[PDB]
Design a protein around this ligand. Structure first.
Ligand SMILES: [Mg+2]
Length: 123
């Protein structure tokens, strides 16, 4: 079951993600419910959600010159409290597959959620 309490997900990270959520939901058209369901419930297929995921990586400045996720930039952008969790969650998710940047972004989130459903979250 996903860990959801006063300390996790890190409140400061959730707060920082709010304006990125607004920008990305406005650009991609994903619904609030699709995001919450992927975060807390089952992995599901939603093309706008995949693009929302890609958009968050771009808005968080954790992508390379072609828009692909740079995993070191991503790790560095996270609070230290989740560095360990992130490393294990991603150690078998190093090389995304997918045609589009949205497909690859979804590949990452699915791989992370499959690896550690307790700590995975999406906002
Ligand atoms: Mg497609």
């Amino acid at each position: 079951t996903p860990r959801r309490d006063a300390e996790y997900p890190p409140p400061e990270l959730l707060e920082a993600l709010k304006p990125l959520h607004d920008i990305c939901l406005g650009k991609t058209g994903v619904t609030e419910e699709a995001i919450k369901k992927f975060s807390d419930e089952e992995i599901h297929e939603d093309e706008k959600l995949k693009c929302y995921m890609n958009c968050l990586f771009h808005e968080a400045k954790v992508v390379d010159d072609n828009g692909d996720v740079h995993l070191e930039k991503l790790h560095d952008s996270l609070p230290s409290s989740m560095h360990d969790i992130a490393m294990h969650m991603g150690k078998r998710c190093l090389y995304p597959e997918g045609e589009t940047l949205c497909d690859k972004a979804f590949w990452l989130h699915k791989c992370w959620k499959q690896s550690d459903p307790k700590h995975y979250f999406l906002v």
